[PDB]
């Protein structure tokens, strides 16, 4: 299938309390596989998925040095940024970075990603062409002019089209069923009397991977979108996800309601009922 690799970096300044805290995490699709935290006792890239543990000590050692250098670079960026925005040197600011590659079933690069946000707002993004930038404002234009003059996009293309795609392809091979085969949800309906005239029907989807899923209630085959309470998809803490959809129904009318489940792991879309 189609797959993604993404690195997510968060730098948070704390002027007076030392260098900004740098945290990195790496994902393949919805699976986290690495982390680094500048505030750990011995900062190093650590595994967070079983299938990366096989990578040798030079993998871990290279990546650790890259994160330590990136923490220093981000520290410099935050200084430049408070300067560009004419902000106080006393306050805490956030720099987030998100980069990686989307690849199709053939494992060819579909799209490259390389963007930044300052204080939770879009700042600069590499465009789909991977050769030009979109700056959000005049501050971001300073970064843009510098990175154009330095041919930064050209330097970054190499990683997105090369190492990003080849290491993703590697991780996908080594993850095997964990990354390439969808885990279908375990589904059930529960019934929660509110009074003698109303009851809640709750349709559960548990232990599924990846996160993408659709849950809907239907009354006599008609979608009940207006009257469905749908919780945001949430992590189980074991690399799988959960979701539920609930509808309030008149007592004795339960038989009119069906829950409909769409997920990549199911042989076909499921219809469930109170049973």
């Amino acid at each position: 299938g189609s797959h993604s690799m993404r690195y997510f970096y968060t730098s948070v300044s704390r002027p007076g309390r030392g260098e900004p805290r740098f945290i990195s995490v790496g994902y393949v699709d919805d699976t986290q596989f690495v982390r680094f935290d500048s505030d750990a006792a011995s900062p190093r890239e650590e595994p967070r998925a079983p299938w990366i543990e096989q990578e040798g000590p030079e993998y871990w050692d290279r990546n650790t040095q890259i994160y330590k250098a990136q923490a220093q670079t981000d520290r410099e960026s935050l200084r430049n940024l408070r300067g560009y925005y004419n902000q106080s040197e006393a306050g805490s600011h956030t720099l987030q970075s998100m980069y990686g590659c989307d690849v199709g079933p053939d494992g060819r690069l579909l799209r490259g990603h390389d963007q930044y946000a300052y204080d939770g707002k879009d700042y600069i993004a590499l465009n789909e062409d991977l050769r030009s930038w979109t700056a959000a404002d005049t501050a971001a234009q300073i970064t843009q002019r510098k990175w154009e003059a330095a041919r930064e996009a050209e330097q970054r293309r190499a990683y997105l089209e090369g190492e990003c795609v080849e290491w993703l392809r590697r991780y996908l091979e080594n993850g095997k069923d964990k990354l390439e085969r969808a885990d279908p949800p375990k589904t059930h309906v529960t019934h929660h009397p509110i009074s003698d005239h109303e009851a809640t029907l709750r349709c559960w989807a548990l232990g599924f991977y990846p996160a993408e899923i659709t849950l809907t209630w239907q009354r006599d085959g008609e979608d009940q979108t207006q009257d469905t309470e749908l919780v945001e998809t949430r992590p189980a803490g074991d690399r799988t996800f959960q979701k539920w959809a609930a509808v309030v129904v008149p007592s004795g009318e339960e038989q009119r309601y069906t829950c409909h489940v769409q997920h990549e792991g199911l042989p076909k879309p499921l219809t469930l009922r109170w049973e």
């Binding site: 690195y7 990195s24 790496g26 690495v34 890239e45 993998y59 290279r62 990546n63 890259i66 994160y67 250098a69 990136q70 670079t73 410099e76 960026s77 430049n80 940024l81 720099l95 980069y99 930044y116 700042y123 600069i124 970064t143 990175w147 330095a150 930064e152 330097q155 970054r156 990683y159 190492e163 990003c164 290491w167």
Partner: peptide
Amino acid sequence: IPRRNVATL
């Protein structure tokens, strides 16, 4: 694997 990139904003 993460990229090596030393460019500041």
